[PDB]
Amino acid sequence: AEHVPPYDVVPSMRPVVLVGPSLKGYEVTDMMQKALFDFLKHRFDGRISITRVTADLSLAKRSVLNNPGKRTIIERSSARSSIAEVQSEIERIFELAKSLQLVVLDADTINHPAQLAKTSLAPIIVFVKVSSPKVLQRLIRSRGKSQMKHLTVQMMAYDKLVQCPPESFDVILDENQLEDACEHLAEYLEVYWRATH
Amino acid sequence: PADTNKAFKTEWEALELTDHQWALDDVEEELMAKDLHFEGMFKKELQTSIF
Amino acid sequence: KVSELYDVTWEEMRDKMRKWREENSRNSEQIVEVGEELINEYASKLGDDIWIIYEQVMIAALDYGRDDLALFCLQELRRQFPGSHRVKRLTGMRFEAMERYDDAIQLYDRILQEDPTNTAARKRKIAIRKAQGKNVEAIRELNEYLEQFVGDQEAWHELAELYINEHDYAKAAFCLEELMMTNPHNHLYCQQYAEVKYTQGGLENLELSRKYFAQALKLNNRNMRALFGLYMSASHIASNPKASAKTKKDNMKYASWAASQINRAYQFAGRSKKETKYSLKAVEDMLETLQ
Amino acid sequence: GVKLTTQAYCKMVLHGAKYPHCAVNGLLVAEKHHTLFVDCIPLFHGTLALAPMLEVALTLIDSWCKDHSYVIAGYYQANERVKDASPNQVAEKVASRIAEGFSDTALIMVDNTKFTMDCVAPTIHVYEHHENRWRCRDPHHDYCEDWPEAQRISASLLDSRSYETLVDFDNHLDDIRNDWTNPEINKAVLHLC
Amino acid sequence: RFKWAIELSGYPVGYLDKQVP
């Protein structure tokens, strides 16, 4: 049936991707993840790599097998998806992992774990969340006068992400202080780095 | 009204001297004079939800 | 909904409900969502504005298949106003929403017996007739009601729609003329009358359709349906093999101008938002339908 | 069977659910089981017995399909009454017009009784053109590529209140900046599998 | 104009039909 070999083709070590607390590309989430990216780059410089991917990566098992049903609607799905660039980015991830240096992915399209599960990447999911929806709403209001038009979609994304089961996520960063979350992520990063070394 | 029959007669007499004068005889020529006013119609943004 | 995906005061909710009341919108879900919260958490804030909200929320909840809120609102309204006639109409609507038509019929007959010059009961009886699929009886009763009470535009529009659904277009055109006579400044009636005349018959009907499409486009310059109809009618009349040369060239000129305006409008649309999918497509439609 | 795909079924359900109190209709396209459909384009809601806008929409959709090598092969309609699922004159006329350019076209009728929230049945009646009439070819068949995945996706989309973003041809005529190809629904059904 | 074209074929107070020039 499945006949799945144990030796599934995966990168040398699992890539790390950050999700939450809202839609990526919006101001609050962008700043929240930018701070963590800067901390990770500065603290662990020398053996840590950062990779940015522009094209969508959520299509890796279905609609990628040249399936007649779903490979037709790939050019008019409001995304730069011509399959070839997806494969090129997958090979890029594999070759970057082959260097045996810990790498992270800045997936501007990924905003939910369940859309990156059936893929063969099997990455590391880092969850950063706000304790209350009211706090997130107040932060959005205080950020500026431009995100008011996009408040509803951000709240929808936040509440949709809340319902995700904890087992889907690998680590949780729900500490109010920036330093606490930074150290919590750094300890896991160092543990994983020592595990493969 | 005071008397229904009086009003009926008055309206009958008033209506008898009215004749049709169509107001759409030369609408096309008036339309063709200038381009349509497509200015100030694609401003703002399409509404997403309530409020 | 306040502090829940939105940040609005109770005044804003009241204004939104009023605006939804002015124009006959039938988005029952949002109306129920706002109304239940307004009733629950801000009942005392509204001095005397809660009764019309009660009626609107009850109607929306009946439309939304949620009868507990409808019963609650009906109980509140009946307690506030004892023996009123609008509350009886709401009760009849609730009865007929549960497929209990005999009780609603007897209730409306009682209402008419108490007051013979009432209008809503007759309309609800016509709605009951329509709900069972009995189209001819509904048309006859609506004709009788219009004979009794002339000057009611909702009934005229409903009769026009019913005649349209039965593929009888001359009487629908007559009703649309009656509606257009009272409201000569509304382009929607002209557009619909032009569509009916287009669908009705042949050459002179097409000429009238083109005339009224032009009139509708003159009244409002943003009506894309009127422009498309004008272009289509001009092209259809131009190619008719039973027309004189003068009419043929006039219709060709009209079609050329309409096509130019359509192309300019689509270029304007494509300038703002970048999709470039119809500007490459409407041109093919114009070219393949030329002459 | 015709073996409808998942995107067409989900878009049809969403269009039918966006306007519960009206009557809706659209088009079905197929690539140039028997004939596998690819997706559907919702046309109109409200009053459907009017010629000019239907003709304009048919011409535009036909040209667009010809550009991308498709062919119009099906016509789906849903009435207003909850106990009415038989074709009317408009549906028969449109289906007969379509049949002259493509063989074994499909006349799909949406059944309001089986229009449950998540799923109880495919709630679809399929009519085939035999001589000069149409017959209900319903041997209790499965007119879907894969019923469980399709019903799961449709139920999830309905529960997510995602029909508020679906846009048909009427909304495109109201404002040109709308899109009748619905990329958002395609993205949602691609991600949610 | 071509191909796609559909023909649908099938006493409110005042209703007359003829002449009156």
Side-chain angles (χ1 to χ4, degrees):
Chain A
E2 52 174 3
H3 73 76
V4 43
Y7 45 94
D8 293 326
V9 180
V10 292
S12 303
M13 31 182 164
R14 315 168 62 177
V16 183
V17 57
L18 284 73
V19 304
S22 175
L23 290 175
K24 292 181 64 63
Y26 287 141
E27 196 161 6
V28 178
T29 307
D30 284 0
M31 305 318 295
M32 288 288 293
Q33 299 202 4
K34 177 71 63 178
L36 293 183
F37 286 159
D38 196 309
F39 160 78
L40 263 306
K41 174 181 175 298
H42 273 54
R43 172 171 172 175
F44 290 100
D45 180 65
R47 45 93 169 182
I48 291 295
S49 179
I50 50 179
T51 300
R52 295 185 65 260
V53 46
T54 303
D56 197 333
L57 303 182
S58 301
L59 42 147
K61 173 57 66 179
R62 284 293 295 181
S63 72
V64 83
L65 66 154
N66 196 16
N67 183 269
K70 290 178 176 57
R71 207 227 180 184
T72 60
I73 42 173
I74 306 288
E75 199 76 13
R76 60 181 194 263
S77 183
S78 66
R80 184 242 177 179
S81 58
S82 178
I83 304 302
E85 59 272 31
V86 178
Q87 304 294 149
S88 71
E89 291 297 330
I90 296 311
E91 299 297 330
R92 184 190 194 96
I93 294 179
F94 271 90
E95 63 89 12
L96 288 180
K98 277 297 181 179
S99 179
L100 293 183
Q101 301 296 332
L102 190 58
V103 72
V104 304
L105 300 182
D106 179 59
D108 300 2
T109 314
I110 297 299
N111 292 325
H112 196 279
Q115 72 189 171
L116 206 61
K118 298 185 62 179
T119 179
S120 60
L121 276 304
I124 295 179
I125 303 175
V126 174
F127 190 14
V128 42
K129 64 176 182 178
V130 179
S131 301
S132 168
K134 178 63 192 62
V135 182
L136 175 61
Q137 177 183 77
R138 187 163 294 271
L139 289 175
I140 294 170
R141 279 181 285 183
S142 63
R143 187 61 208 92
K145 50 193 174 183
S146 59
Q147 278 67 22
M148 318 308 299
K149 55 182 180 301
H150 302 339
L151 193 149
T152 305
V153 289
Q154 294 181 24
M155 293 300 300
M156 289 155 53
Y158 176 81
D159 63 60
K160 184 59 175 58
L161 184 55
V162 165
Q163 292 183 349
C164 305
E167 47 86 13
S168 181
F169 308 95
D170 295 4
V171 297
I172 304 297
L173 281 72
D174 53 355
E175 289 80 346
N176 171 252
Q177 292 298 110
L178 173 143
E179 311 296 332
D180 200 328
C182 286
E183 303 310 314
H184 191 283
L185 182 56
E187 296 303 322
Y188 186 87
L189 173 136
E190 190 66 26
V191 166
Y192 189 86
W193 188 64
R194 296 183 299 101
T196 169
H197 296 79
Chain B
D3 291 330
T4 59
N5 301 87
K6 177 262 170 186
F8 287 168
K9 292 299 175 298
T10 301
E11 289 199 357
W12 182 94
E13 295 173 0
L15 185 67
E16 191 65 30
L17 50 85
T18 58
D19 195 2
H20 190 263
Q21 189 68 251
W22 204 16
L24 307 183
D25 280 321
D26 49 358
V27 54
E28 287 102 332
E29 277 66 25
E30 302 172 23
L31 261 183
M32 297 280 289
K34 69 199 66 57
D35 304 0
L36 294 183
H37 200 50
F38 290 144
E39 284 71 18
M41 61 171 298
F42 282 136
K43 60 179 62 180
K44 68 184 178 300
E45 188 57 36
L46 305 176
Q47 186 52 245
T48 66
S49 178
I50 57 181
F51 304 100
Chain C
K1 210 61 178 299
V2 57
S3 67
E4 309 169 9
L5 292 85
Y6 293 102
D7 45 355
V8 291
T9 68
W10 61 278
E11 296 89 339
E12 182 63 32
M13 295 182 178
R14 176 188 59 185
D15 298 330
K16 174 61 66 176
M17 293 291 295
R18 185 216 305 174
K19 192 180 69 61
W20 280 346
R21 199 185 310 107
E22 301 296 335
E23 54 171 9
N24 301 330
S25 302
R26 202 177 174 179
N27 41 10
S28 305
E29 195 170 21
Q30 304 167 347
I31 295 178
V32 169
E33 284 190 356
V34 181
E36 61 172 3
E37 172 191 351
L38 259 180
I39 293 172
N40 292 334
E41 306 179 16
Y42 294 91
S44 63
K45 199 63 62 182
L46 310 175
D48 268 326
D49 288 315
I50 198 65
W51 323 113
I52 184 66
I53 295 182
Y54 276 151
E55 183 185 21
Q56 181 180 356
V57 171
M58 174 189 177
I59 295 185
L62 269 184
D63 208 313
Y64 196 65
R66 181 176 171 180
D67 302 13
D68 52 358
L69 184 60
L71 182 56
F72 163 70
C73 296
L74 180 56
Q75 285 185 350
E76 300 299 326
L77 285 183
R78 190 190 298 104
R79 282 208 301 101
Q80 173 53 233
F81 300 102
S84 182
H85 275 172
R86 297 173 63 172
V87 185
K88 275 185 171 295
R89 177 182 66 97
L90 299 181
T91 301
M93 292 206 310
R94 180 185 180 271
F95 271 179
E96 80 181 51
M98 304 188 303
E99 298 173 344
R100 297 171 58 186
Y101 300 139
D102 320 335
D103 312 1
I105 288 182
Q106 79 179 17
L107 211 165
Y108 294 147
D109 278 4
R110 191 181 310 171
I111 293 180
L112 288 180
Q113 191 66 29
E114 292 188 0
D115 190 9
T117 176
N118 200 23
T119 65
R122 313 172 184 267
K123 295 180 177 181
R124 293 316 302 175
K125 295 181 67 176
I126 296 180
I128 290 183
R129 273 297 199 275
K130 182 181 62 180
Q132 300 170 347
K134 301 179 181 180
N135 306 328
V136 281
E137 293 82 3
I139 289 189
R140 172 174 295 274
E141 294 187 25
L142 190 51
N143 281 332
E144 295 177 5
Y145 167 77
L146 273 175
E147 168 185 330
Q148 294 185 348
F149 292 84
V150 206
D152 195 3
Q153 307 180 13
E154 277 196 7
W156 282 112
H157 203 179
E158 181 66 25
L159 181 61
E161 172 181 339
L162 293 179
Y163 271 142
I164 288 183
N165 284 335
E166 203 178 310
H167 304 293
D168 189 7
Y169 296 95
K171 307 185 180 185
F174 169 79
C175 296
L176 285 180
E177 288 174 353
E178 173 66 34
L179 276 180
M180 189 195 314
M181 221 162 57
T182 310
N183 305 79
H185 64 283
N186 214 334
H187 61 287
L188 301 174
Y189 295 111
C190 302
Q191 159 192 324
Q192 192 174 13
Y193 181 71
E195 296 187 35
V196 171
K197 276 300 178 182
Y198 184 99
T199 320
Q200 180 181 4
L203 191 60
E204 57 276 51
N205 302 130
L206 279 173
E207 219 277 352
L208 289 175
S209 175
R210 180 198 68 188
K211 282 287 187 180
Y212 277 97
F213 272 140
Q215 168 71 3
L217 190 58
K218 188 189 72 176
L219 283 181
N220 182 23
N221 293 12
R222 321 280 182 82
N223 204 20
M224 200 62 56
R225 288 184 181 95
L227 185 55
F228 270 106
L230 166 65
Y231 171 77
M232 200 59 57
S233 182
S235 298
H236 255 255
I237 295 185
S239 298
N240 194 306
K242 298 193 303 177
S244 58
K246 179 187 61 179
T247 63
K248 196 177 308 301
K249 69 181 187 64
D250 298 359
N251 291 277
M252 270 183 292
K253 168 179 56 185
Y254 298 152
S256 177
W257 186 86
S260 178
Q261 297 304 322
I262 290 178
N263 197 23
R264 190 171 70 93
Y266 260 97
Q267 289 291 339
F268 244 78
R271 184 191 317 275
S272 181
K273 187 178 181 180
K274 299 165 300 304
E275 64 282 341
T276 67
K277 198 175 63 64
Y278 339 102
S279 59
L280 186 140
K281 183 52 58 184
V283 51
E284 296 188 5
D285 181 19
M286 293 162 52
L287 291 182
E288 74 175 29
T289 333
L290 202 58
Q291 281 77 49
Chain D
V2 205
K3 261 53 180 179
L4 280 71
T5 180
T6 65
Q7 316 89 288
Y9 191 92
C10 85
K11 291 182 176 179
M12 179 190 304
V13 172
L14 292 184
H15 187 215
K18 187 176 180 181
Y19 298 104
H21 45 77
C22 301
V24 300
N25 64 331
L27 281 180
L28 292 159
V29 313
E31 181 58 42
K32 181 61 204 63
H33 195 182
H34 296 150
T35 48
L36 172 66
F37 294 147
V38 182
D39 62 326
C40 73
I41 303 300
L43 282 184
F44 290 104
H45 66 266
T47 302
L48 311 177
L50 294 177
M53 297 306 156
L54 182 58
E55 173 176 353
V56 174
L58 282 180
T59 301
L60 265 183
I61 298 306
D62 168 59
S63 188
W64 176 82
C65 293
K66 183 211 59 54
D67 189 15
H68 287 194
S69 70
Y70 288 89
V71 54
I72 304 178
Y75 178 85
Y76 79 94
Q77 195 186 11
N79 297 27
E80 182 178 357
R81 303 288 174 261
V82 84
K83 294 182 178 182
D84 193 66
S86 60
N88 46 10
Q89 179 172 334
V90 181
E92 291 180 343
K93 282 291 194 302
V94 174
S96 300
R97 177 64 62 176
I98 294 179
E100 295 183 356
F102 186 78
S103 60
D104 59 281
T105 186
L107 177 58
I108 294 190
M109 300 297 297
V110 180
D111 199 1
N112 295 322
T113 54
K114 283 85 176 182
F115 212 95
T116 330
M117 168 60 66
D118 43 8
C119 77
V120 181
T123 177
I124 280 184
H125 290 208
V126 179
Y127 288 73
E128 302 287 344
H129 188 49
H130 176 248
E131 21 93 350
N132 53 43
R133 299 198 304 103
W134 300 81
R135 295 188 297 100
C136 179
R137 186 187 65 173
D138 185 15
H140 312 286
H141 211 2
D142 184 13
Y143 308 106
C144 296
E145 192 181 36
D146 39 2
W147 171 241
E149 177 184 348
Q151 63 89 357
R152 174 176 53 87
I153 294 177
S154 68
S156 186
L157 284 178
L158 283 181
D159 196 299
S160 181
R161 288 166 52 108
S162 182
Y163 45 75
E164 298 180 354
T165 59
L166 179 135
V167 27
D168 50 358
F169 197 83
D170 235 335
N171 300 16
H172 169 67
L173 280 181
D174 288 359
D175 202 326
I176 308 298
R177 292 181 294 187
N178 294 329
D179 196 318
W180 35 270
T181 56
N182 309 93
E184 287 291 335
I185 301 302
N186 296 329
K187 177 183 298 178
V189 73
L190 246 58
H191 287 184
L192 193 143
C193 291
Chain E
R1 184 209 63 177
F2 252 4
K3 224 177 185 181
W4 312 109
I6 298 92
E7 301 84 349
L8 295 320
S9 181
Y11 63 147
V13 262
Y15 203 75
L16 287 316
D17 304 75
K18 65 223 66 56
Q19 38 84 42
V20 191

